[PDB]
Design a protein around this ligand. Structure first.
Ligand code: VZY
Length: 185
């Protein structure tokens, strides 16, 4: 792909984070803490899952960023509407305002309803995410495998401003403590 020149500097929005997340001083890394991180509750925080949003809101144009997922066993990545549900249980789907892929139990899947199996021969250590607002496209790229395409959502009905979306996943296994990191331009 040739999307690198649409690179945007994403930072994480602390106020949206699940109360167990630890976001770095530079707001570029996030991992699961082993306890509540001593913050007040608010209506923005994701309550049920270890999720956080980017601070940036996109309503036009082409945007590209990269995320490091080295040594994680589970995570979700993509974009979502600014008005997605924060509290309680929900599935990641375009009907609920999410355009995402994930790793879970040694398989990669796109967050369609129902979910779609991905075909990845080289497990990625870094993921590239491309959004074309006007075209209604969200695409995912395998940076470890020379930028190969992972998945394209097309005919997207965003129906609102978009925010970068992250889930570091639970760490029940003791093998999923590693952070998500926003990679430099
Ligand atoms: C305290 C702790 C435990 C496990 C992992 C980390 C972490 O930041 N990952 C390593 C890295 O910086 O690449 C921190």
């Amino acid at each position: 792909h040739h999307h690198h020149h649409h690179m945007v500097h994403i930072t994480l929005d602390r106020n949206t984070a699940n109360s167990w997340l630890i976001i770095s001083k530079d707001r570029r890394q996030v991992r699961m803490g082993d306890t509540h991180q001593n913050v007040s509750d608010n209506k923005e925080r994701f309550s049920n899952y270890p999720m956080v949003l980017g601070a940036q809101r996109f309503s036009s144009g082409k945007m590209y960023w990269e995320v490091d997922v080295t040594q994680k066993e589970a995570w979700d990545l993509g974009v979502c509407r600014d008005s997605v549900q924060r509290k309680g249980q929900f599935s990641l789907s375009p009907e609920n305002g999410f355009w995402t892929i994930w790793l879970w139990q040694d398989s990669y899947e796109a967050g369609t309803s129902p979910q779609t199996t991905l075909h990845i021969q080289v497990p990625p250590c870094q993921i590239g995410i491309f959004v074309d607002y006007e075209a209604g496209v969200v695409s995912f790229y395998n940076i470890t495998d020379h930028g190969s395409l992972i998945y394209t959502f097309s005919e997207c009905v965003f129906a609102g401003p978009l925010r970068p979306f992250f889930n570091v996943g639970f760490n029940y296994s003791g093998g999923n403590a590693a952070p998500l990191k926003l990679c430099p331009l």
